[PDB]
Amino acid sequence: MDHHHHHHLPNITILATGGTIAGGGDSATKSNYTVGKVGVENLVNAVPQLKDIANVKGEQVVNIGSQDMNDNVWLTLAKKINTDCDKTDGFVITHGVDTMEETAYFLDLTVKCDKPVVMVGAMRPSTSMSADGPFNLYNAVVTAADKASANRGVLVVMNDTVLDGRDVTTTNTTDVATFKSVNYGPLGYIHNGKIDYQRTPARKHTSDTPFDVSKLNELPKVGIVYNYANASDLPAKALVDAGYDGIVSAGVGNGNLYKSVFDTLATAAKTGTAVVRSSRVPTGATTQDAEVDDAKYGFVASGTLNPQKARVLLQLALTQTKDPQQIQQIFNQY
Amino acid sequence: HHLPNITILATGGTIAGGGDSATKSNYTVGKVGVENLVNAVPQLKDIANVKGEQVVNIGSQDMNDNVWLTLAKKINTDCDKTDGFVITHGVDTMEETAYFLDLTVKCDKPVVMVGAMRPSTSMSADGPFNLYNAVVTAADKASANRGVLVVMNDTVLDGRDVTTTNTTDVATFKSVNYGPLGYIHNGKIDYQRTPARKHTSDTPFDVSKLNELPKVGIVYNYANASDLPAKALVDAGYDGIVSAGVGNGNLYKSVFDTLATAAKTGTAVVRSSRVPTGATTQDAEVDDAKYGFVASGTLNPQKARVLLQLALTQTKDPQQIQQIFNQY
Amino acid sequence: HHHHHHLPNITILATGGTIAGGGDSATKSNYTVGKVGVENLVNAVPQLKDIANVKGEQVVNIGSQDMNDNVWLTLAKKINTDCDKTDGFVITHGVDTMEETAYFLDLTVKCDKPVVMVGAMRPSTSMSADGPFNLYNAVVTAADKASANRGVLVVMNDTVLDGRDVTTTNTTDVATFKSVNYGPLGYIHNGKIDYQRTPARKHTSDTPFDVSKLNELPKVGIVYNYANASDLPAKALVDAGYDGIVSAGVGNGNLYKSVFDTLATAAKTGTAVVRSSRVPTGATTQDAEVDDAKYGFVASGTLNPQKARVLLQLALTQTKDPQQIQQIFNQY
Amino acid sequence: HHLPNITILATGGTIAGGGDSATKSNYTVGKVGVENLVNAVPQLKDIANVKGEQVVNIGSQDMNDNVWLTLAKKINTDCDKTDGFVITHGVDTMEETAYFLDLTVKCDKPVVMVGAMRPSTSMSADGPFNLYNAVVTAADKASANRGVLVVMNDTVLDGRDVTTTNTTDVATFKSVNYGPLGYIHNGKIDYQRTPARKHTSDTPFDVSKLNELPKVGIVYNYANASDLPAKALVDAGYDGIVSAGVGNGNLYKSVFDTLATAAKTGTAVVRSSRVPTGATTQDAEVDDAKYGFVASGTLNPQKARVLLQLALTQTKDPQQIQQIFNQY
Ligand SMILES: NC(=O)C[C@H](N)C(=O)O
Ligand SMILES: NC(=O)C[C@H](N)C(=O)O
Numbered sequence A: 001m002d003h004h005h006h007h008h009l010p011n012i013t014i015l016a017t018g019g020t021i022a023g024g025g026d027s028a029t030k031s032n033y034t035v036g037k038v039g040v041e042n043l044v045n046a047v048p049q050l051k052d053i054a055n056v057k058g059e060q061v062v063n064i065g066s067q068d069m070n071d072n073v074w075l076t077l078a079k080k081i082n083t084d085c086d087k088t089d090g091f092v093i094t095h096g097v098d099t100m101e102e103t104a105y106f107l108d109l110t111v112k113c114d115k116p117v118v119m120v121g122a123m124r125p126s127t128s129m130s131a132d133g134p135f136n137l138y139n140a141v142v143t144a145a146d147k148a149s150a151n152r153g154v155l156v157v158m159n160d161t162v163l164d165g166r167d168v169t170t171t172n173t174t175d176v177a178t179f180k181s182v183n184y185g186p187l188g189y190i191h192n193g194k195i196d197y198q199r200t201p202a203r204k205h206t207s208d209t210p211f212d213v214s215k216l217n218e219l220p221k222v223g224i225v226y227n228y229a230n231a232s233d234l235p236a237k238a239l240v241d242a243g244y245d246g247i248v249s250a251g252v253g254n255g256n257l258y259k260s261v262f263d264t265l266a267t268a269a270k271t272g273t274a275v276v277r278s279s280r281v282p283t284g285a286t287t288q289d290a291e292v293d294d295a296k297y298g299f300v301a302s303g304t305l306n307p308q309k310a311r312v313l314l315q316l317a318l319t320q321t322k323d324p325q326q327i328q329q330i331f332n333q334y
Numbered sequence B, D: 001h002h003l004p005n006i007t008i009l010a011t012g013g014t015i016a017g018g019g020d021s022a023t024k025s026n027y028t029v030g031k032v033g034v035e036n037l038v039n040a041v042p043q044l045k046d047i048a049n050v051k052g053e054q055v056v057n058i059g060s061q062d063m064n065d066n067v068w069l070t071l072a073k074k075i076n077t078d079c080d081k082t083d084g085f086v087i088t089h090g091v092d093t094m095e096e097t098a099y100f101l102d103l104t105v106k107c108d109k110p111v112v113m114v115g116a117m118r119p120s121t122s123m124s125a126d127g128p129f130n131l132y133n134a135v136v137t138a139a140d141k142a143s144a145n146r147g148v149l150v151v152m153n154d155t156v157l158d159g160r161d162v163t164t165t166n167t168t169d170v171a172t173f174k175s176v177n178y179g180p181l182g183y184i185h186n187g188k189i190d191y192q193r194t195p196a197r198k199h200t201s202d203t204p205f206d207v208s209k210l211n212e213l214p215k216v217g218i219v220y221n222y223a224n225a226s227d228l229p230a231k232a233l234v235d236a237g238y239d240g241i242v243s244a245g246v247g248n249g250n251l252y253k254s255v256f257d258t259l260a261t262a263a264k265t266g267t268a269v270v271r272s273s274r275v276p277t278g279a280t281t282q283d284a285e286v287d288d289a290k291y292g293f294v295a296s297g298t299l300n301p302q303k304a305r306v307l308l309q310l311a312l313t314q315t316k317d318p319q320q321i322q323q324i325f326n327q328y
Numbered sequence C: 001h002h003h004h005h006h007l008p009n010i011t012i013l014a015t016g017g018t019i020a021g022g023g024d025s026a027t028k029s030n031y032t033v034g035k036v037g038v039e040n041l042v043n044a045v046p047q048l049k050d051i052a053n054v055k056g057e058q059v060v061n062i063g064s065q066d067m068n069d070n071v072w073l074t075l076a077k078k079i080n081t082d083c084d085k086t087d088g089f090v091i092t093h094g095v096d097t098m099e100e101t102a103y104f105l106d107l108t109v110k111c112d113k114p115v116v117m118v119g120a121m122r123p124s125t126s127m128s129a130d131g132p133f134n135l136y137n138a139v140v141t142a143a144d145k146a147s148a149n150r151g152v153l154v155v156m157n158d159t160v161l162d163g164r165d166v167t168t169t170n171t172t173d174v175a176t177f178k179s180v181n182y183g184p185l186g187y188i189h190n191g192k193i194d195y196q197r198t199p200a201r202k203h204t205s206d207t208p209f210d211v212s213k214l215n216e217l218p219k220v221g222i223v224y225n226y227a228n229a230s231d232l233p234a235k236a237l238v239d240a241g242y243d244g245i246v247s248a249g250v251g252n253g254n255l256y257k258s259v260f261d262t263l264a265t266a267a268k269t270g271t272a273v274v275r276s277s278r279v280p281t282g283a284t285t286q287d288a289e290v291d292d293a294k295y296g297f298v299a300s301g302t303l304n305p306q307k308a309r310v311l312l313q314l315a316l317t318q319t320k321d322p323q324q325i326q327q328i329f330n331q332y
């Protein structure tokens, strides 16, 4: 019989992928830096207070700028998380900000582990005055260690805020406060190492999706084309000529397409290419029942998913189905 | 005779649109003529003598260089015949046309763009009061010398910074980096700001005898981005390419490789960002000098395209193009 | 059906020193001492958690130039009482009198588990501060099972030094600590120690010195010898009834005549008198120029004056007979 | 070829000692005279015309101010009658006599001190060759103007930095901070250094009329140090006190308090260190200027005593004493 208890700190695994969080330059003050050149051990050791909140173990997955994120790394991450779920209490992924909102959503759809998975980055390199990385990493570990964080999907933690992987996006090129869930808001705020969660995502995620990438070595090919005045149809045609499985249109306004672009995508859809209309506009849904007769052309409306997120869901949809009506149902549920 | 003379130049948009009913979110664009738009707001007679001309009647998703050239040449030619201009237009590409005119209009009389998120037929249609406030703005002598303006949702916005921020909200138009110039209340404007970037008669861009513009395309960056869009533009001999980069203008490695080649082979390359606010800067991760790339600053990709097209009427030299991107 | 990784439990007993000091900039040389608490020193080296389960206790927070018998007694009693409650001890301390504390504990600690002393020549706030890595290596040493049964140790500048022979050799050099007669026990590289030596003199649980019930130690002072030396210092210790006097002699423990005269008198009155030397290396021997048995004096051997004071104080807890004190100085 | 006239001034020491056995350690100092020592090294006739004078015959543990005065006066008076001096002396306080002479000798001709760790009767006794090498050094014209020297174990050492480092080793004498001046091999010296601190004829210390020196005592610091030694020197009215401090010149609190009070009464107080190498610095843990204390630099406590006594023949102002300790 024990006569007293002791507090046990959770085991948290850090999966490091690079990013400005791991970036460095030669001056504390100059803006120039190189990404992904500092290892995970260095990041942990720069936050000596992590020992107060978790038993941390670091693993270097890759060390890249997130501008070079790709399908291979996504599959690696999802499989590692799903395989290693039973071995830890939670995960933190250090990652670049530039495509964090894509990876987070991919993982939000493909992770099956029911322990928290928290992504984190930094807007200033590790070497800069007032670098944001250390406290962001601390708060990410706080979030991954909180029992309340489970069953909320894959999270992003930046600037004292817990954000869901589906709605989160980077809103500013340089500001440390850039990450916002611009349609539906954050889940919780962090103060003094404690989170007050007031929201959770209603769209199905993680173990409630059908997307199972455990055996996959590649993902369906999906490209993104931009719309604007006098838009060339040559980007769309190039993707069609290469046999792309899907194309997402970054439309103008509520997902509208320049006529040339429309014409190429209509034609492609008729031959079986999947075509999703999203929007270059930074907030709001690309809706059904506006100026485009989606049913007639075999197009899908992306809802609040921006083009790059729409790409993520469409690649996954394409592992299950090629039928536009079933792909629309997916875009209505995940 | 005591009121200003204001010319409406109509191009279409949902402001000139039409629904099957008041609630139905389904609607046709650019179908009402300018005369019907003016006549639907009889209170315009309280504030201006309004004359309307139809330029085109299209959805702004189909806006093109030919319409832009038409508009600038018309405004420049007719400047002396009127006191102010209001341009009715679609929302979708208003931010592009506004900036093109901001750079090519030489009249320093007010030029004010306006649109609507809802057609006239819808409940609580936004177009009537928007049109009224646009005419108020074009009639205000304080609106002069501020560049080309967009007036939406009781706000006056400069054509360089203004952009649409939401796919359906009547309050979509915002100057997301530097803020609005003034707010409109009870038919009056309190202007507290003006753009510092050179505009209108302070730019060298002269489109009076141009019938076409240099070819400039936009490629998007994302994880695992294909280089095929960029290669298709290079293969067609595009004069320039704007990159909608990730974060602070960054490029996916395959796209970076193609654009790096393009910049040495006769294509001007501008790095902009898919991120909705903030500058694409120099002196971050990309050595622009080494590659011959230009950084867009606060110009988003579609606006960077506008400025690159016009730069390429003057020069192909990346240093000179960067200096243009630092002044306008 | 399952194994669990475990790290040694190490207790850090803090006493102050420049290791716990501070200055007003990274470059200036004027340091405060004994200002930072143990928790703050430990927190500053997060890598400690990967080699040990560390707990810290503040004993005092002083400059070691003010170290005294009361702190010595506290340290020995604490280590002896808590031996069964940890796997090893590190003591943070000033450099100035480290060599004295180390030898006192070497004689009075009865735990055979590692006891490792550590300090710094610079505070944490100075450029290239030595304390963080010094602390790290001290914990590496205390956690190494090979460090047991070697007596009390001092770990400085990647070197493990025995508490009997270790001394500070330079006023400012980070490499000051050396075992100047017999050498170090081992060197530390990449968190591992290659021990090649151990002290042969009896230490720790092989000594008879038991301070567990003592509130105070016998009074022992030190007098310096030099040309024309005054006998007044020696006279002042005699007049106060000191239990012992150590001579910091010239050369091989020799005394200026007037100091000699005072101490020869004192020895016959029952004051214990130890000849040591101001010379920094080598033994103060018998059978040179002084007939120790005639005068009733003890020769210190390789013990320098301040170390000889430590042993004499302890000897005086057992005995006042010069022959017996000499045998103590031949064994410990 | 003419041999230099060298004078040997003998003071005693183990070099002049003897015991009953070649192979036991017991000996007494001064069993032999200077004539005996000279005649035991007939090889000296190869290199110098040697004359011996016995000044005293003591163990250097009993060296005192009166012998120092006698030595300096003798050297300064007899400088013109000879080409160089060798002083045979005990090891124990050689480093004090050498520095006293380094500051008070005005003769620029060589003055070389020498002793032995083993008595003359010992197997492998070091004194014969030591004496030979000291006469070599005194006979070398290159030895002039280097200050008073100590020659032991084939090494020429300056009087300021030289100290005995080991209780028994024949190689004990070292210049522990700044190194030797030269090494001797086959009767020849390669000098590569000379002391920069002012010595001999470049000091103001003139002892020619003095028959006593200011009273200066030395107190030791250690854990739980008694203030009683310090208080005794204060109560006797000592002119100066040197502290053998711990580490970089630090003092035990009760010793510090005694000396702080003494300094305000006018006693000169120098902080030195028991630590065998390195300077006792200013700008560490003690505010010397506040207390009226002087930092000794590289001077050990016994050497600091030498310079303090001499300073006190000129001044008792602590600022001026510090300037002396910075120059000599
Ligand atoms: N702030 C950042 O992390 C930007 C970096 N280019 C990345 O996404 O890896
Ligand atoms: N509200 C609008 O005006 C949208 C329409 N597609 C346009 O831009 O012409």
Ligand SMILES: NC(=O)C[C@H](N)C(=O)O
Binding pocket: C016, C017, C018, C019, C033, C062, C063, C064, C065, C093, C094, C095, C096, C097, C119, C120, C121, C122, D247, D250, D285
């Ligand atoms: N470096 C040091 O620790 C010197 C300090 N005076 C001490 O012994 O406490």
Ligand SMILES: NC(=O)C[C@H](N)C(=O)O
Binding pocket: C251, C254, C289, D012, D013, D014, D015, D029, D058, D059, D060, D061, D089, D090, D091, D092, D093, D115, D116, D117, D118
């Ligand atoms: N070796 C020596 O000369 C030691 C002797 N006690 C002396 O200094 O006179």
Ligand SMILES: [Mg+2]
Binding pocket: A004, A006
């Ligand atoms: Mg317990």
